[PDB]
């Protein structure tokens, strides 16, 4: 998950072509993360270990 609510800001960079940046972030600032269930990861890793 990327919990920050980024917003895209359009900028016009040269004739007839645009560049898209990030504008203000709505809300509060938070960290990006990934979750895994650790008992299932442990069982899986032990199963690799027996091989």
């Amino acid at each position: 998950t990327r919990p920050n609510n980024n917003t895209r800001k359009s900028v016009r960079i040269g004739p007839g072509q645009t560049f898209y940046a990030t504008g203000d972030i709505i809300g509060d600032i938070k960290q990006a993360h990934c979750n895994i269930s650790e008992e299932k990861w442990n069982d899986t890793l032990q199963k690799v270990g027996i091989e």
Partner: antibody
Amino acid sequence: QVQLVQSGAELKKPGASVKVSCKASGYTLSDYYVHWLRQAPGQGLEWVAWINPTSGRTISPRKFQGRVTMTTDTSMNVAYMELRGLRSDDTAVYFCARGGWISLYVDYSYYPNFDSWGQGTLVSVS
Amino acid sequence: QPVLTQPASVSGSPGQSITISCTGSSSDVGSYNLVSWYQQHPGKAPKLMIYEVNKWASGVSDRFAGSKSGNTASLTISRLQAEDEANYFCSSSTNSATVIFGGGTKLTVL
């Protein structure tokens, strides 16, 4: 047990400034966001701002942008909210309140889940 | 920016049911289900009585319903007793990352 003891009331000239402080009791201020609220005589509850007391990051809706400036001193465990450029409207009962728990992975800053409230302190105007 | 609305004053009947509602925009009510209901007596501080529509607040009797529908939400009080003589504010959060209150409504006697 919880308390959000606020500072006393104080009347000011319109266009003046005032610092309003909100004390923590029974918990450390760094856990929760601090929301600032108001109630004029005979009017409803008006939402003013929140502060994430750790980073000092704040948002106020539109009406108070520039009016309200924010600080905290978590060593003293106190939260402050300063108003400038007063008007007759500011005869109102400001409340401080703690909102959501601060979690590094989910944004609870912005939604109306006020647990406990300040007793009420009155910025006033002649 | 505050826009949220509700009937400014109504009356109930003991033992019956009354509807106390609020309305907004898809930006703040239908965008997310984050809603709560508050009781404040004059001379005292408020008291959260609903949050997230129907997560159960402390000390709330089963009279106090909590529902949401699209652009609207309501406390559909049932059995509607008299010891709640002060107002019942609505509140929701906007997609602009702000909290909004209603104009308050009085659960009058009753």
